[PDB]
Amino acid sequence: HMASETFEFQAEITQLMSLIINTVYSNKEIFLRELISNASDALDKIRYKSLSDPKQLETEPDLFIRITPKPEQKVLEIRDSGIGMTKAELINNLGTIAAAGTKAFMEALSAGADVSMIGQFGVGFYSLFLVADRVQVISKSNDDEQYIWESNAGGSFTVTLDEVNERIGRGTILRLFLKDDQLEYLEEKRIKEVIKRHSEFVAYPIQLVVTKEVE
Structure with missing residues (x-):
């Protein structure tokens, strides 16, 4: 299905995104920690669900976090x-449920909280807009087909049945379209340094996919 469906963000999420995408906050690298945390949580959920439904793991037996620059x-x-997200979960989780949390965080920001507190308000996902101006969330839950959720920080987002990306057995890809001045996050050394600042207690392998010219 090449036909996409368009949806409106809850207004507070739109407000949060505009604040993030436009902030001159200095420590943009915090996004990586927040996405790795979300990734770790999604892995926890499938592991926990598998405790009583082992077949849930069979669509992708390897549990990992993988980071792939596409320079x-x-x-x-x-x-x-x-665990991945069904179509309904993408719509719900990314486009609505975060509303209240985004409002609480925005108030904190107004009072002077550090942007790095974002994950403590349960809305760390949106920190991706510190370094990216557009994102595709590609997700495959055991409970649905593979779907693409796409947002450019504007008030609307699309969901499209996925007929263009690699099949993922199960899970989620955040595909960040980096801003032109944030290309340092394509670089292996930079990525490694940032990850290491907070990767100490991640239970899953964090894999970096590096493209090396032979010779």
Whole structure:
């Protein structure tokens, strides 16, 4: 299905995104920690669900977080083999449920809270807009087909049955279209340094996919 469906963001999420995408906050690298955390949580959920439904793991037995720079497309992908999101979950989780939390965080920001507190308000996902101006969330839950949720921080987002990306057995890819001045997050050394600042207690392998010219 090449036909996409369009949806409106809850207004507070739109407000949050505009604040993030436009902030001159200095520590943009915090986004990586927040996405790895979300990835870790999605993995926790599938592991926990598998405790009483082991077959849930069979669509992708390896549990991992994988980071893939795609320098030519100025894209950075953060992939997990976690629980994934059905179409309805994408619509719900990314476009509505975060509303209240985004409002609480915005008030904190207004009072002077550090943007790095975002995950403590349960809305760390949106920190991707610190470094990206557009994102595709590609997700495959055991309970649905593979779907693409796409947002450019504007008030609307689309969901499209996925007929263009690699099949993921199960889980989620955040495909960040990096801003032109944030291309340092395509670089292996930079990515490694940022990850190491907070990767100490991640229970899952964090894989970096590096493209090396032979010789």
